[PDB]
């Protein structure tokens, strides 16, 4: 809404290598590989399709602005993250074991590093049964 635009335009221009005002899967993949990532074409297409509002397969600056302005901590995201934790809370007591949490975080999905999970758990505030109250996580990430 102010000088944020110049920042977002700088950010946009990092991805749009050929300068045509449009970001393709190929260009997104170029930036990610330069960070040492190895995304598949399926992952590149999902990322574009989430931002690409007119369905032409590429990202223009207004679509980029829309995604950079999207709310990440609103009530809808809060409830979705809470239901994601609830998948691992079979009994529905509001608690996950620290051991189950570390295994899920390190071995499934994106696979966080041990140091990353260490940082998660340190902020978790475990109880005296090795259980994590994940509602605290949800609130902590959406505050």
């Amino acid at each position: 809404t102010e000088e944020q635009i110049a920042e977002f335009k700088e950010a946009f221009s990092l991805f749009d290598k050929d300068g045509d005002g449009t970001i393709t899967t190929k260009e997104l993949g170029t930036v990610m590989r330069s960070l040492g990532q190895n995304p598949t074409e399926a992952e590149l297409q999902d990322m574009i399709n989430e931002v690409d509002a007119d369905g032409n397969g590429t990202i223009d600056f207004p679509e980029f602005l829309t995604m950079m302005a999207r709310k990440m901590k609103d009530t809808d995201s809060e409830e979705e993250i809470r239901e994601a934790f609830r998948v691992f809370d079979k009994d529905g007591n509001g608690y996950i074991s620290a051991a189950e949490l570390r295994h899920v975080m390190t071995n499934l999905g994106e696979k966080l590093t041990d140091e990353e999970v260490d940082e998660m758990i340190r902020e978790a505030d475990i109880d005296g049964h090795g259980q994590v109250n994940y509602e605290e996580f949800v609130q902590m990430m959406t505050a």
Binding site: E7, E10, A11, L14, F15, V31, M32, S34, L35, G36, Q37, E43, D46, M47, E50, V51, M67, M68, R70, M72, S77, E80, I81, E83, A84, F85, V87, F88, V104, M105, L108, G109, E110, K111, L112, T113, E115, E116, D118, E119, M120, M140, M141
Partner: protein
């Protein structure tokens, strides 16, 4: 359901953690010798996009 749930938690946490400039989440970019400001910016964009993808995939499975 389970992979989609794990990935939403992990991408959400990676977005949150990238707000703290000294988080251990920054040490994973081992291809880069020195993390510069413009790297931090592009990484934040990518992470925001990965979170939105994970949110959509979980909404489908939930």
């Amino acid at each position: 359901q389970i992979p989609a749930a794990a990935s939403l938690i992990q991408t959400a946490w990676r977005c949150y953690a990238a707000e703290n400039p000294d988080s251990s989440t920054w040490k994973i970019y081992i291809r880069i010798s020195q993390l510069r400001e413009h790297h931090r910016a592009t990484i934040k964009v990518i992470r925001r996009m990965q979170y939105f993808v994970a949110k959509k995939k979980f909404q489908q499975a939930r």
